[PDB]
Amino acid sequence: MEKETGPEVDDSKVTYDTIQSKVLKAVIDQAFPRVKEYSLNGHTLPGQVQQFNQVFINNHRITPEVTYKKINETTAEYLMKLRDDAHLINAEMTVRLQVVDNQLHFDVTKIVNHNQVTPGQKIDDESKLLSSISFLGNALVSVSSDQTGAKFDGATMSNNTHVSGDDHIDVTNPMKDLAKGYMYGFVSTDKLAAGVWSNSQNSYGGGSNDWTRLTAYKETVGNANYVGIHSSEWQWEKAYKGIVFPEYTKELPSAKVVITEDANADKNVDWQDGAIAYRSIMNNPQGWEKVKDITAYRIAMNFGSQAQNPFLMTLDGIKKINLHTDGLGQGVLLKGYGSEGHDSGHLNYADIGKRIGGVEDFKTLIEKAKKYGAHLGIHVNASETYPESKYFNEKILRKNPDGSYSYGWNWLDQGINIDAAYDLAHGRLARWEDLKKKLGDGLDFIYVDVWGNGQSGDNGAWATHVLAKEINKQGWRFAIEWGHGGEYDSTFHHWAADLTYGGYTNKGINSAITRFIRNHQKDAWVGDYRSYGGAANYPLLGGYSMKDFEGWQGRSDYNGYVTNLFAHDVMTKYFQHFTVSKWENGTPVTMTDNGSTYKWTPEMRVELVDADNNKVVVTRKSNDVNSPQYRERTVTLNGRVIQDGSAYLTPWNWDANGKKLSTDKEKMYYFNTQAGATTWTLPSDWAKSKVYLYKLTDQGKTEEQELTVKDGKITLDLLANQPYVLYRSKQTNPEMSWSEGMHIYDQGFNSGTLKHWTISGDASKAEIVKSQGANDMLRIQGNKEKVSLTQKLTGLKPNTKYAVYVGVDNRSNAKASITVNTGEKEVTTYTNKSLALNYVKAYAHNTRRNNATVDDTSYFQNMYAFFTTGADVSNVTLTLSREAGDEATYFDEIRTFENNSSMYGDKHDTGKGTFKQDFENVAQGIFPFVVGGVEGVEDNRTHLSEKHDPYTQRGWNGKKVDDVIEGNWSLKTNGLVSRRNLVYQTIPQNFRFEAGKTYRVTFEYEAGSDNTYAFVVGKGEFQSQASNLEMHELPNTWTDSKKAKKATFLVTGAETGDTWVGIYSTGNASNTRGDSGGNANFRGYNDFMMDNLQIEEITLTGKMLTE
Ligand SMILES: CC(=O)N[C@H]1/C(=N/OC(=O)Nc2ccccc2)O[C@H](CO)[C@H](O)[C@@H]1O[C@@H]1O[C@H](CO)[C@H](O)[C@H](O)[C@H]1O
Ligand SMILES: [Ca+2]
Ligand SMILES: [Ca+2]
Ligand SMILES: [Ca+2]
């Protein structure tokens, strides 16, 4: 390429002024808000050297009519009149340039559109809107090829672990053309560096063209090439289908430059200096300060009406983690906080799940969690909804150009995508406000699922910023799913933090520049996941690795959750207590993974600092990618080694909420992923002290040991993959108030003792044991007389209807019971040997082998009693008991909660009389049924359907069957045809067909197809040697009827006491009547609904004897 030339600059007709602080001077044009050049400490950086007195308004070139006033020594103002009659532009904007020390601020301080526009109202011509303002062509700062050390460094979005988003370009003549959007951009010489920020929500496209708030441009002036950094286009008045968006969607344009000399004392001036300085001018995502102390993220899941994780139970998990981590902070995402659980009731943010304890128990959880530094978040959706939701309406639904619905997720029900732009223009904000009003203060984060994939239309930079602002205004921190989502406002990205998702192309932000700037503010990065290669092959800063134990994607591994916190997250979070100050890359390496062989340049040393001038240095032990030392680091703190390879001994000087610890609460954590002795030098303020070591378990600090300090050093030869904590004085474990608010002490058997139970009988026959999944359970076995355990139920309300259940898995034929005595009345329920395996994926005692109770299976099911308090609630007791037997009964979870069911002879309490279930007051689940094995262990596609006329009912969008037969609730199964398996069944603990007695079972049902579902009678454990079943295939209920049909069956209890009834998915094909896809799913061809179940004990007389 030949040396390049361009026009020289004739400034004979230009009048310049200067504005200046004590350190920075800017030469500015009086004709237009342009900076010609900057001076700081006798060094210079150009701005926009060649005048370009044009702006682009609505993508039309306009020569503004400008008037100027120098306001004061640092500040100048420009009034810019904008007129283009052909394009209906008639407006004016005011711009200020202001120097603040080493910063230059560019602000549009006022915009007036002389066209009539009313936010929230119709506009008849959208071209009358003043929708975009661009000052592209006027660089805010630049560097010239004639300057020594001239370089540009910029970041773009990459989520591919093989491909850095960063460009590093020497500014030379000749050089390659450059006209490109960037998220972050720096220019520098050997003397000065500059960074640029803008609030522009411009996009040039997806991928690396998105979040492009800056544009870099090469311009040749005379014999020199300049690379300048411009703000990209800003947005202003916008509409959707003629409806002008709310005023809050308009944010005045702003940009800033910062200019700096060496800022990290390396005696070199480069982008890193600019990046340090940039932290003073940048936006900061709201809530970022919390991130560094949220060490233990996870999800607690509810789904399908089951109430797997009631709000108050989540507090007990918080207490386990508080003990086991010795007080590290937590972040629990409540996926299924609303409606019937996860993926129910979307858009109605304020509909806090009633079956998990409602707003009252949510409020208690938020408040009580504060002292454990445990922050709660919720999962919401702003992209799709279901007929059941209050906010389902034709107007909000997304339609394709052809008029068809854009169908969304199908799982419990068939959802339809919403039009997010319509939503914004029609009151979305108020839905957040309603949640805030109902819930109150103290919620930490809103995680918006799906958003950023386009299901709801535009989910790009501008639309995301608007959404985030609505959430942030309520006091909530923003979190999103995708690695590429929410770059401006997010603090957490699920597919960055859960390293398993998506594979190597779909991870966190692969940018050294961006991570240097923002590592401490968000979990948005590339973590250690060797099989992805590139940046994910042992990042020096770590990166959040999220696992779970409360039901998300079936996850239940408590011990592995904790090991993972210490293996990845403790050091990741340690670094976030500092800001990056220096970043050094090594020589390129060659890697082969994921179907390619490629080059990657790794970081070899990263330094960080804090406001106390502590210095952390992280060094990769080798640049050789084929050496084990490539995947090892050293970490020093003020030169003292705190990590070396597999082991660390790291200080922690912050409480669970991030507050500075008192001196006597300062501690160190030890963790080593390998066996072997390690030796550590103590800091001077430990070297002469006594030192005590504790093994951390789910019981807190254990196995106290005083260490021998020799020559200021300690040596630790401890268990691999086991956390320990060290202190300078003896420590104890506090009272945890297990299960506070739940009316009973420790109902998950987490406290290591049964001493708070009153035990009647031989106490040696009751003990806490661990399941095959390491989950604690009460076990009674080997007893020749009854064994009972009793507690008072505390804190109840007088004259109030309650439910209580215990989870029970009985391997004995002996009676295992739950009994409540209110003082005035006693009620009891029992089970003999359990006969139904547990298929609920989000429940910790499902039958997946790794969750198994014993013998590789789980038959846990909730065993209920229903009672009513009297006037005095000072002596209400709960007793778990077991009659004599050699085999074991296992119990876990005793939940007592308000309930208004009337199942027993039209009365609430457990007792005699005709059994009825109208599904209107279900405590949880699908009682008296339990989900069967039709889908295996799954987020079962059977739940309690909620009415929303007309959308849930026959006729809407051609629906063939009602979701709800009577009242507000029914029992719905979505699409589980042709499975040759049991959809659900009663169990004796929930309804016992007594030996030799006959019952009339009646219900109303909808069925979309003939003989796809059957009513069945069985006994004992169902086996799909297949079990004998009495089979009654059911006809469709709509081709010859305007409503649900009534079914009636006689059932006699087997002498073995183990008779049950249920609904079975036959082998027959369903009939979608020529419909397909979403229409076929929506319309209910493949569905079954039940309501108004009655089971009446009868004596067969007269014509009953004929059938
Ligand atoms: C998918 C996922 O991990 N989470 C939820 C979700 N994410 O949005 C997507 O677009 N996901 C996606 C990922 C890969 C390929 C296609 C799509 O969206 C869903 C709602 O649209 C749903 O909530 C996803 O979670 C699943 O939820 C079901 C129950 O509805 C079930 O619990 C699954 O185990 C979850 O992964
Ligand atoms: Ca430097
Ligand atoms: Ca009903
Ligand atoms: Ca539903």
Side-chain angles (χ1 to χ4, degrees), residues 339-340 343-345 386 388 412-413 943-946 963 972:
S339 179
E340 295 303 289
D343 287 334
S344 296
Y386 301 92
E388 65 201 33
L412 293 171
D413 302 286
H943 76 302
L944 303 176
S945 49
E946 182 176 21
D963 282 349
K972 177 173 172 176

Side-chain angles (χ1 to χ4, degrees), residues 157 183-184 211 213 485-490 509 514 518 522:
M157 183 59 74
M183 303 191 303
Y184 305 96
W211 311 106
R213 60 192 58 105
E487 196 277 337
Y488 201 82
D489 296 299
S490 189
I509 303 172
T514 307
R518 299 195 183 272
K522 53 183 70 177

Side-chain angles (χ1 to χ4, degrees), residues 262-270 272-273:
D262 188 24
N264 58 9
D266 70 358
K267 309 181 105 83
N268 293 318
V269 178
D270 62 19
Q272 302 173 67
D273 304 297

Side-chain angles (χ1 to χ4, degrees), residues 914-942:
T914 298
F915 180 84
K916 303 173 190 182
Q917 176 60 290
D918 62 11
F919 299 99
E920 302 298 314
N921 283 287
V922 183
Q924 57 68 234
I926 61 167
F927 187 98
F929 311 103
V930 302
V931 294
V934 56
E935 301 179 282
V937 177
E938 183 56 80
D939 291 324
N940 313 97
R941 291 176 174 77
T942 293

Side-chain angles (χ1 to χ4, degrees), residues 767-825:
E767 68 192 286
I768 304 171
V769 302
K770 291 187 195 278
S771 75
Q772 298 179 227
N775 200 347
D776 300 290
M777 303 177 295
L778 173 63
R779 183 184 68 192
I780 298 171
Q781 72 175 15
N783 60 313
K784 294 172 174 183
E785 296 292 358
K786 191 176 195 188
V787 171
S788 305
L789 293 83
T790 303
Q791 283 189 54
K792 290 195 180 180
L793 295 177
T794 59
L796 297 169
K797 291 171 182 181
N799 193 35
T800 296
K801 297 172 176 165
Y802 285 97
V804 57
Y805 68 75
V806 64
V808 66
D809 183 341
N810 194 6
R811 307 295 172 100
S812 178
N813 297 301
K815 182 178 295 188
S817 311
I818 184 169
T819 301
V820 177
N821 191 305
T822 66
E824 297 302 324
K825 185 165 173 186

Side-chain angles (χ1 to χ4, degrees), residues 320 323-325 558 695-702 722-723:
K320 294 185 75 69
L323 281 168
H324 208 154
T325 65
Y558 173 92
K695 188 184 179 180
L696 286 169
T697 74
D698 56 273
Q699 305 296 300
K701 291 177 277 306
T702 72
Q722 171 60 235

Side-chain angles (χ1 to χ4, degrees), residues 640 649-652 666-670 681-683 685-686 714 724-727:
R640 189 178 67 80
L649 180 72
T650 302
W652 202 277
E666 294 171 356
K667 60 187 163 182
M668 299 176 184
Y669 290 105
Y670 181 71
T681 300
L682 297 175
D685 63 354
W686 288 58
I714 58 176
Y724 299 81
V725 66
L726 293 74
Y727 285 82

